[PDB]
Design a protein around this ligand. Structure first.
Ligand SMILES: COc1oc([C@H]2C/C(=C/C(C)=C/c3ccc([N+](=O)[O-])cc3)CO2)c(C)c(=O)c1C
Ligand code: SF4
Ligand code: SF4
Ligand code: SF4
Ligand code: SF4
Ligand code: SF4
Ligand code: FES
Lengths: 127, 196, 180, 166, 240, 127, 384
């Protein structure tokens, strides 16, 4: 259905949150990868709000501790996924209308993500 | 009708008959029997002598009998007196250090120019020729271009500020002896053919 | 066959009274097809980011080898291309270029696409190497045309008209058949 | 006397030579058919004054290198240029003539500025008849002294005036 | 010596010979990802699979020619439609989560996966019927990208196809185990807690990686593999 | 084939070539001025290969305006070759890096390559 | 008088040198000197990928070039087993016969101008100009068009191509009938050409004169009829023939060729039903431009195909076709590599020139020009 739109739109919000943490805790954030189905569109149309698909929070020593990814514009089983490297931690987040962003049935609030990122920072970061 | 009798004649004398699954026929005659056999071929009713294509196999990946090879094309026009339409090729190898060949200019005048070209492009001198004079390449040009040990002789491409290209160092395409940019080339880049 | 002289005379006269057929360049705009092979243009995405990712697929498939591409790595703050790679130096020697469409055909990002300018006559070999900033879609006119408009103070008018510009030329602004 | 040494007369004679440019065709290859098409009844270089076409070289000022210049033809064309009156101009037409073109080998002169002094270069394969009109107009304003290059310089009226013939 | 037969050709070959060397020795070809010269073969990429008969008694499953020894009088089949079909399938499984980074990939033309894919991939299925390249249309694997492992080496864990060449090298050749995987399953990725890449022979993996994962920082983004002018010479910094 | 003259010494190259030339008649000889960068002659450097047919002569890259007195020495050189009756003049365009290794290749290879790549030239561009 | 009718002077179109061994106003014998355009296709093509060489192919015969493109394409298709879609085949025969009409127009315009009158050069050229627009419609180029591909053609026909083609096909028959009405009932050309140009079919066969000049002497030998390649088996066709080989019969037979070629253009136009455009085999065809952002195989195949190319199997091949100047063919030797091992071209204008000393022997000195224009050489084809 049309929920698709808000998904990518919601994705941008997510990035803001991520960006915020870098400005908050003074730790390096990086745009990892943009959308290939946006680079290789030559004349074809592209309506999505952003072209950035993957980003991460890297410590001083460069190894990321938090990874976030989104399904491409034409891929099936569209979702957003999260991962903690070295910690075997993965999340499958969807967006349920009216409620908000939900990990299954549990809404994903900004506070939840912020606490998760801080736990990762204290645990996995080397320097 | 005459092509079948050509095959029956040559196979009876033990000359190899080359055939690809595409519909073109090669008949390789040795040097001695070449002149007399092809004279008999013209007598067999071959009006038209289309091509004289000279070949240098110096850099061919698989080895071949001899380096140079001259191929004539004998045809009988379908719309002329009694035209079957029989067209075929005659290949005759010429050694690297023996660039000889008797001409069929006396039979077809078409070998006047054509053989000269093969003498111009390759080191092959045609015996019995009225005039073996360089046709295409400049009169002061030294050598025979189309043989692989003869350079193509390229010039670099030019750009703004010291930025140049040497195309022979720029080519990503592979020849037959080029191993490739990886350890090797196998599979579909060593030869690929669809099965209709 | 004396009649043939008279018939020839008569038809030549009939054409004499038939005035029209010709087109007077430069006074009349040359009618070009939308698929015409002209000066290359580098196209940009809606984001403004440039489409060229500096991959040198245009240069290898060039039968004259006239295309030069030095790459570089994007600056995350102010990126130039979409990926991690852009074209620092993009030169095409129009005296080597033979106008195939092989660089257009092989460009995966749709950046390099032929335009419509043919009015690129110049005096010097060294000046006929058209660069990156000499072909962008934003630019309106050829090198001698822009130099003449600058040393003349009079704006550029291209001497061609097309029924429409292709979708591959998104952003290519040109005179279209008289719509303006 | 070279069409110089008078504030009025040099303008007058440059006007004359520039507008009355009389091409001397040297039809070589597929560029030359695009040179012929620039005279038919749709797009004719038969207006600026180039209606007539002096095949003899003793009578024409503009020589257009139109096609691939194979080496066996280099010297002949050379003398065709030397068989021209001194007030003569040479345009290099095409990619095969301007540079080596795509044929980068033993058979082609990789820039015809080698054998003849080029006035105007015109890329294209073949350069559209309308690009040829643009080049003859380029040369028109060049021989009036109305031509400037990218580097900021005004270009001499007649190229082949600066070469120590031999 | 041992007598071996590949599809029409018979070769004398010393006994300890691997089926892969004997196949290439006979003039035929088969993909190769997991194994590498001077590296211990362990069957991982499963590309070198051939058919084997040892008398006409064909083996049940395709033999890994990378880690299999040869025996006298053995028949090896690499041209049967079964072999090419299976090879195309494994190429698809390898290309599964690849980032689509070829055009900006520093590996360019000298990439083994590209060449073996165009060699053995897309078996001719049986017309003028329109073909589909990939079946996998799901969300692909995304991990950390352009990760500098050392001032000379850069690491893209997405391009890794999970061979063993770099970790096997580091364990075997220099004796410096400073690179190995972290997690398992499809989440596996190369990483280290030794960051400086202490081994002084670290640069050789730069050549071995059949993908653009480990690349040269000091030569990053200068030209494509073909655009470079390759001149073979000898290094005179030291007496070796 | 002899190698006279020296790199980047236009006047010494010219004097040694004066001496080694002698009264050699150049009616059927060939003069190959090898350089890089076709168009820009104002900054050109030049080598010379003289193919007489009976013995050949080499001059390294020492002439041209790129060196002090290379323009005047190249003018004198072309005047000297023209005085002796030369009619067939050629120019070879090599990559700069070639120019150095081309004088160290065996005579047959170097000379074959040069004759294949030669461009007929008007000596007026060097006088 | 061994007179030097030099290269390009006087008005020997297609630069060619002639030593006319000749005393008076007769013609004893003409000794030709060619090679003044030698550029090196047979050699340069050995260093260009099969995909690239389609940029080298049309430029040999720059008038009827799509025959060169089609000959090269078909030979490689046979060598690697490519499939012609019906629509691609119909489009290829359209462009073939249309480039043939254009080459014929240029040939007769040049022949009339070369000795005689100037006017009818323009009218025929007018039509030629229109034809070029059609090409510029689909290929974006006047000639030297790089459109054909090994599998088929590059991309599809625009919406605007077919109506313009219908316009030109409706106006042309009257135009060709007008040229023939002017020329056939020849006022002076009758006393100029009917006698000149002695073409005994026996020696024309012996010297390799295939280019439509032989059937003007009454030999029904056409590759479109002798060796159908591009579907010509499936066409209703009149095959022009001549009573006795001269310049007059040659020109009239070629005009009838133009009318039959227009009829073939219309015939092929009618049978055109939408469909595919090129051989979809990914090993031979680059991926479509739209799934470059979805599939990995797409990107790998695009990268490889446009840097390396493809590798056809080891073997030699050759297939002939009929151009406006006769039998044409490419002898392709491939060693299994990305670049062809050798390409040898049977240049019809090359051997068709052997009949110069013969045909114009005993003819007039001026008529040595009309008999060359009537021989229809394209020195891009001869010199090559
Ligand atoms: C003739 O055809 C051709 O020519 C050429 C060359 C020679 C040439 C001559 C003249 C005389 C042009 C000319 C035409 C008309 C006028 N005019 O004033 O009307 C003036 C000059 C132009 O190209 C080539 C190369 C060719 O391959 C063919 C098939
Ligand atoms: S159009 Fe052709 S010659 Fe021109 S730059 Fe592109 S690929 Fe090269
Ligand atoms: S213009 Fe296109 S093909 Fe060329 S380097 Fe840029 S992105 Fe690649
Ligand atoms: S630039 Fe093109 S059209 Fe001109 S001569 Fe060369 S190949 Fe022919
Ligand atoms: S590693 Fe190879 S297949 Fe993967 S993106 Fe790079 S070039 Fe393409
Ligand atoms: S990083 Fe490269 S060498 Fe190491 S396991 Fe992955 S693909 Fe193999
Ligand atoms: S080579 Fe990797 S499986 Fe044998």
């Amino acid at each position: 259905a049309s929920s698709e739109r808000e998904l990518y739109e919601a994705w941008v919000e997510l990035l803001s949150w991520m960006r915020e943490y870098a400005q908050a805790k003074g730790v390096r954030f990086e745009k990892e990868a943009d959308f290939p189905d946006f680079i290789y569109r030559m004349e074809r149309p592209y309506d999505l709000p952003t072209t950035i698909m993957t980003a991460s929070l890297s410590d001083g020593l460069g190894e990321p501790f938090l990874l976030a990814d989104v399904s491409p514009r034409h891929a099936k089983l569209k979702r957003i996924g999260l991962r903690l490297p070295r910690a075997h931690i993965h999340l499958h987040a969807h967006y349920e209308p009216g409620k908000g962003l939900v990990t299954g049935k549990i809404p994903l609030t900004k506070e939840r993500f912020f606490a998760l990122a801080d736990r990762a920072r204290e645990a996995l970061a080397f320097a | 009708m005459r092509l079948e009798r050509v095959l029956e004649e040559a196979r009876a004398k033990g000359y190899p008959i080359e055939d690809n699954g595409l519909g073109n026929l090669w008949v390789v005659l040795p040097r001695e029997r070449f002149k007399e056999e092809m004279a008999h071929y013209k007598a067999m009713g071959f009006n038209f002598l289309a091509d004289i294509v000279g070949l240098d196999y110096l850099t061919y990946p698989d080895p071949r009998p001899e380096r140079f090879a001259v191929v004539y094309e004998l045809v009988s026009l379908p719309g002329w007196k009694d035209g079957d339409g029989s067209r075929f090729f005659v290949r005759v190898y010429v050694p690297e250090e023996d660039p000889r060949l008797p001409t069929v200019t006396d039979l077809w005048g078409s070998a006047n120019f054509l053989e000269r070209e093969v003498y111009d492009l390759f080191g092959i001198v045609f015996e019995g020729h009225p005039d073996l004079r360089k046709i295409l390449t400049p009169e002061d040009l030294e050598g025979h271009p189309l043989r692989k040990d003869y350079p193509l002789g390229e010039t670099p491409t030019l750009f703004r500020e010291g930025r140049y290209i040497i195309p022979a160092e720029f080519r990503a395409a592979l020849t037959g002896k080029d191993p490739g940019l990886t350890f090797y080339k196998g599979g579909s880049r060593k030869g690929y053919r669809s099965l209709w | 066959t004396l009649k043939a002289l008279a018939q020839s005379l008569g038809i030549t006269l009939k054409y004499l009274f038939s005035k029209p057929v010709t087109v007077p360049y430069p006074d009349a705009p040359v009618a070009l097809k939308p698929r015409f092979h002209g000066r290359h243009v580098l196209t940009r995405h809606p984001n403004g980011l440039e489409k060229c990712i500096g991959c040198s697929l245009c240069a290898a498939a060039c039968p004259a080898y006239a295309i030069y591409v030095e790459p570089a790595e994007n600056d995350p703050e102010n990126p130039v291309s979409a990926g991690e790679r852009y074209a620092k130096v993009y030169e095409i020697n129009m005296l080597r270029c033979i106008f195939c469409g092989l660089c257009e055909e092989a460009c995966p990002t749709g950046a390099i696409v032929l335009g419509y300018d043919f009015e690129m006559a110049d005096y010097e070999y060294s000046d006929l190497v058209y660069g990156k900033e000499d072909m962008l879609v934003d630019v309106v006119g050829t090198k001698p045309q822009r130099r003449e408009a600058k040393r003349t103070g009079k704006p550029v008018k291209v001497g061609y008209v097309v029924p429409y510009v292709r979708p591959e030329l998104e952003g290519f602004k040109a005179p279209t058949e008289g719509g303006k | 006397r070279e069409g110089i040494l008078f504030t009025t007369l040099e303008k007058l004679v440059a006007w004359g030579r520039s507008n009355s440019l009389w091409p001397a065709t040297f039809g070589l290859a597929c560029c030359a058919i695009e040179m012929m098409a620039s005279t038919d009844a749709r797009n004719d270089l038969a207006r600026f004054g180039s209606e007539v076409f002096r095949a003899s070289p003793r009578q024409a000022d503009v020589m257009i290198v139109a096609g691939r210049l194979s080496k066996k033809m280099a010297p002949v064309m050379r003398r065709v240029w030397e068989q021209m009156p001194d007030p003569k101009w040479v345009i290099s037409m095409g990619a095969c003539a301007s540079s080596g073109g795509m044929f980068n080998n033993y058979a082609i002169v990789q820039n015809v500025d080698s054998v003849v002094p080029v006035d105007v270069y015109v890329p294209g394969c073949p350069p559209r008849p309308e690009a040829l009109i643009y080049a003859v107009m380029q040369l028109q304003k060049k021989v009036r002294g109305q031509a400037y290059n990218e580097r900021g310089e005004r270009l001499p009226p007649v190229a082949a005036w600066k070469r120590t013939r031999g | 010596m041992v007598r071996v037969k590949v599809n029409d050709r018979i070769v004398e070959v010393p006994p300890g010979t691997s089926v892969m060397d004997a196949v290439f020795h006979a003039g035929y070809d088969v993909p190769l990802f997991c194994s590498e010269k001077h590296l211990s073969p362990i069957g991982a990429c499963r590309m070198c699979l051939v058919r084997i008969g040892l008398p006409i008694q064909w083996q049940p499953k395709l033999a890994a020619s990378c880690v299999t020894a040869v025996a006298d009088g053995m028949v090896v089949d690499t041209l049967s439609d079964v072999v090419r079909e299976a090879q195309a399938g494994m190429v698809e499984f390898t290309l599964l989560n690849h980032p689509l980074d070829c055009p900006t990939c520093d590996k360019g033309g000298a990439c083994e996966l590209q060449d073996r894919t165009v060699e053995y991939g897309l078996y001719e299925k049986y017309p003028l019927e329109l073909p589909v390249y990939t079946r996998f249309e799901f969300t692909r694997r995304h991990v950390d990208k352009h990760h500098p492992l050392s001032p000379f080496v850069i690491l893209d864990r997405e391009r890794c196809i999970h061979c063993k060449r770099c970790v096997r090298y580091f364990e075997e050749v220099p004796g410096d185990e400073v690179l190995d995987f972290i997690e398992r399953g499809v989440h596996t990725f190369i990483g280290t807690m030794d960051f400086g890449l202490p081994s002084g022979f670290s640069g050789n993996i730069t050549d071995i990686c059949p993908v653009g994962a480990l690349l040269d920082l000091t030569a990053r983004f200068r030209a494509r593999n073909w655009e470079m002018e390759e001149t073979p010479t000898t290094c005179a910094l030291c007496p070796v | 084939m002899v190698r006279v003259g020296m790199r980047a010494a236009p006047r010494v190259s010219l004097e040694a070539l004066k001496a080694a030339l002698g009264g050699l008649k150049l009616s059927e000889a060939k003069v190959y001025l090898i350089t890089d960068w076709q168009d820009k002659r104002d900054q050109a450097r030049y080598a010379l290969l003289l193919h007489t047919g009976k013995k050949d002569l080499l001059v390294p890259d020492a002439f041209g305006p790129a060196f002090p007195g290379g323009e005047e020495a190249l003018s004198e050189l072309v005047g000297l070759l023209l005085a002796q009756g030369a009619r067939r003049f050629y120019e070879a365009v090599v990559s700069p890096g070639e120019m150095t290794a081309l004088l160290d290749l065996p005579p047959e290879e170097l000379l074959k390559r040069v004759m294949a790549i030669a461009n007929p030239t008007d000596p007026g561009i060097y006088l | 008088m061994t007179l030097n009718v030099g290269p390009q002077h006087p008005s020997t179109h297609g630069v060619l040198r002639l030593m006319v061994t000749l005393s008076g106003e007769e013609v004893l014998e003409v000794v030709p000197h060619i090679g003044y355009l030698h550029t090196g296709f047979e050699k340069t093509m050995e260093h260009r990928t099969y995909l690239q060489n389609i940029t080298y192919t049309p430029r040999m015969d720059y008038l009827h070039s799509f025959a060169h493109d089609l000959a090269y394409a078909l030979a490689v298709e046979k060598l690697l087993g490519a499939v012609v879609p019906p629509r691609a085949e119909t489009i290829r025969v359209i462009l073939n016969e249309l480039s043939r009409l254009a080459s014929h127009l240029v040939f007769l315009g040049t022949g009339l101008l070369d000795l005689g009158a100037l006017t009818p050069f323009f009218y025929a050229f007018r039509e030629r100009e229109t034809i070029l627009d059609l090409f510029e419609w689909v290929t974006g180029q006047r000639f030297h068009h790089n459109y054909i591909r090994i599998g088929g053609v590059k991309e599809d026909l625009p919406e605007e191509f077919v109506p313009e083609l219908k316009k030109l096909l409706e106006v042309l028959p009257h135009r060709i009938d007008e040229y023939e009405a002017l020329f056939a009932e020849s006022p002076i050309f009758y006393e100029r050409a009917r006698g000149v140009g002695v073409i005994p079919p026996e020696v024309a066969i012996d010297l390799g004169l295939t280019g439509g000049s032989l059937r003007a002497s009454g030999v029904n030998y056409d590759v479109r009829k002798a060796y159908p390649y591009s579907g010509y088996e499936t066409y209703t066709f009149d095959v022009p023939l001549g009573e006795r080989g001269d310049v007059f019969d040659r020109m009239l037979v070629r005009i009838r060729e133009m009318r039959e070629s227009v009829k073939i253009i219309k015939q092929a136009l009618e049978r055109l039903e939408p469909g595919p455009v090129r051989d979809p085999n990914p090993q031979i065809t680059p991926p479509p431009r739209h799934l470059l952002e979805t599939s990995m195989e797409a990107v790998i195949y695009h990268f490889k195909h446009y840097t390396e190319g493809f590798h056809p199997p080891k073997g030699e091949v050759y297939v002939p076709t009929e151009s406006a100047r006769g039998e044409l063919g490419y002898y392709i030797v491939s060693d299994g590599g990305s670049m062809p091992y050798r390409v040898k071209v049977r240049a019809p204008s090359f051997v068709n020139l052997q009949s110069l000393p013969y045909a114009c022997k005993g003819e007039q000195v001026p008529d040595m020009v009309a008999i060359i224009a009537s021989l229809d050489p394209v020195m891009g084809d001869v010199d090559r």
